[PDB]
Amino acid sequence: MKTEQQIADIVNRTITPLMQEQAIPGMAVAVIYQGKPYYFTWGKADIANNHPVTQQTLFELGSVSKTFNGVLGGDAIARGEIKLSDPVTKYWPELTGKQWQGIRLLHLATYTEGGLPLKIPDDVRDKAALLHFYQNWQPQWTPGAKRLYANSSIGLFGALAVKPSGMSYEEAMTRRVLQPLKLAHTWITVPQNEQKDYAWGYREGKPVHSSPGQLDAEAYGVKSSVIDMARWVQANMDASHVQEKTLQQGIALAQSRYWRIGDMYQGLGWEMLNWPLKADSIIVALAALPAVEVNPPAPAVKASWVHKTGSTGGFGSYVAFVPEKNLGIVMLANKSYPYPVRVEAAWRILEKLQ
Ligand SMILES: C=C1CS[C@H]([C@@H](C=O)NC(=O)/C(=N\OC(C)(C)C(=O)O)c2csc(N)n2)N=C1C(=O)O
Secondary structure: OOOHHHHHHHHHHHHHHHHHHHOOOEEEEEEEEOOEEEEEEEEEEEOOOOEEOOOOOEEEOHHHHHHHHHHHHHHHHHHOOOOOOOEHHHHOOOOOOHHHOOOEHHHHHHOOOOOOOOOOOOOOOOHHHHHHHHHOOOOOOOOOOEEOOOHHHHHHHHHHHOOOOOOOHHHHHHHHHHHHHOOOOEEOOOOHHHHHHEOOEEEOOEEEOOOOOOOHHHHOOOEEOHHHHHHHHHHHHOOOOOOOHHHHHHHHHHOOEEEEEOOEEEOOOOEEEEOOOOHHHHOOOOOOEEOEEEEEEEOOOOOEEEEEEEEOOOOEEEEEEEHHHOEEEEEEEOEOOOHHHHHHHHHHHHHOOO
16 A cells, blocks of 8 residues: 555656656646545746646647547437437538448547548638538548547547537537536636646747647647546546536446457547556557447446547647556646657556555
8 A cells, every 4th residue: 555655756756767768848647546636747837938837737638638529429428419320411411422321420439430531631721621521531441440540530529429419519528528527727728817827848849839720629629737637537437426427427438348459449539458458568559450349339347447648749648547446647748759658657657556
């Protein structure tokens, strides 16, 4: 059983050389141990203006934004507004291209739609460009054949998922997920009064923030603090005291297993592997692989490693938890650094907290 000092000594002994080796300017880390968050901060949120990382510092979550997407989508399922078996064209009729018949919300939500591009092109800047973009996309595989990770599929899923509620994605995410969970420092658009807490990302030694883009809120655009992300991991790990019945089940649905791709199972936003597992088995994510459908989706199991990585131009994020142990970690950095380094550091910390 670890004391808070033993936790701090473990986390520092991993993060301190990591930040020097990767030249990370600032990091915020939360460990969930026995269900309780422990907070750690090092370095600068802004090097030139000498602003330290605090527990309020806002980091670009990058693709960890897709976990908020999944939970809001699972919430919509629980409300009865959508079903994953529903066709895409139900919620966007102007998608009359014959290639869209047979594509369901399930596919956009789990990257199995047949091969949408990784990013929405920079050319696309309004509804017309975006509708034209999807209308003229030619699939590479039949729906459900392969998993190909992308922003453009789960990004569209989140925008369509919220149409029954009659609410925008930002508004729905705020009303149905952020506010009920008390995530008061998690933003799609950082308010004026919070700009000063918005850390700068660093790429090649220069400060950068990500630029807006079509479907950015749904795929990569959430900013948040280490305290909120600790609460976000807490709630996804154990929603047993979430009061909203639909949000509680949405969290459960997001950790259901919808597809098997080797040793990994695709949730809604979240990804899972069986626990316990070797570090090397987490350490080709950008490759298209055959997807085996799990139908019905298998309910969540405690003995899993639930995680999501995210990156922007100037930030690297990683969150991971193992529900069987009430154990989890949030890793926020204002520099993008290699994915296997995050996994290895997360594993090293959580392996000593057994
Ligand atoms: C390789 C991908 C595919 S896109 C996806 C996504 C979510 O984090 N990232 C972006 O959309 C993104 N950059 O991705 C990389 C890291 C590939 C990049 O091009 O920098 C981005 C969004 S706004 C911004 N600035 N950058 N994640 C990753 C990852 O594994 O880090």
